[PDB]
Design a protein around this ligand. Structure first.
Ligand SMILES: [Ca+2]
Length: 223
């Protein structure tokens, strides 16, 4: 998160860290046994860390649970990043409480102008590299599709949407991938890609979760 602020311990209870001996991607807890993340975050041997704040220190409330299986959308294309969504089933059910809670799936696509909360432990620098210990947050608006397609000609599909600032200075970054974009208490996006970080006229691109509600529900029901 570039140009953001410190969320505060456990203020984003649905936020998860995907770990393989180090933090590599964010994720969202949608129920006691399932996490939604980005398909490009996939890899064998994933340990989902819940209730995290400082990801380098064990301070209480954390829950480390191994992924029993990661389900990458069958139509995910690594070259275009279309269908950048992945379902992760936990080996055992997570303990839901004040610090650890699931986020609701959307019942409709959010409209442009809607304010959303983006969060993660990704890079905080536009040019350099500086990874934070504690969870960072960012309030950003969903941009219109015309502005989005204008920023990335021929790269935006119906399964993507832009969010952020065209002036630059505020955006999600490396490490934030797979993280939640929450608007009005609903998971509308997943940190997917962009051209650099917090660069002007290059807003962040996110996976349009509202286009996958049926798929998510159907996949979960058969697994
Ligand atoms: Ca910790």
């Amino acid at each position: 998160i570039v140009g953001g602020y410190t969320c505060g311990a456990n203020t984003v209870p649905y936020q998860v860290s995907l770990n393989s001996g180090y933090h590599f991607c964010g994720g969202s807890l949608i129920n006691s046994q399932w996490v939604v993340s980005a398909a490009h975050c996939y890899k064998s041997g994933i340990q989902v860390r819940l209730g995290e704040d400082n990801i380098n220190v064990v301070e209480g409330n954390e829950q480390f649970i191994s992924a029993s299986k990661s389900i990458v959308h069958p139509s995910y294309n690594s070259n275009t990043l279309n269908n950048d969504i992945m379902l992760i089933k936990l080996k055992s059910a997570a303990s839901l409480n004040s610090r650890v809670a699931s986020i609701s799936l959307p019942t409709s696509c959010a409209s442009a102008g809607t304010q959303c909360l983006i969060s993660g432990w990704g890079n905080t620098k536009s040019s350099g590299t500086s990874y934070p210990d504690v969870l960072k947050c960012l309030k950003a608006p969903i941009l219109s599709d015309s502005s989005c397609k204008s920023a990335y000609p021929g790269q935006i599909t119906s399964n993507m949407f832009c969010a952020g600032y065209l002036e630059g200075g505020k955006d999600s970054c490396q490490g934030d991938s797979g993280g939640p974009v929450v608007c009005s208490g609903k998971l509308q996006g997943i940190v997917s890609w962009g051209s650099g970080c917090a660069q002007k006229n290059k807003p962040g691109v996110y996976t349009k979760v509202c286009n996958y509600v049926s798929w998510i529900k159907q996949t979960i029901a058969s697994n």
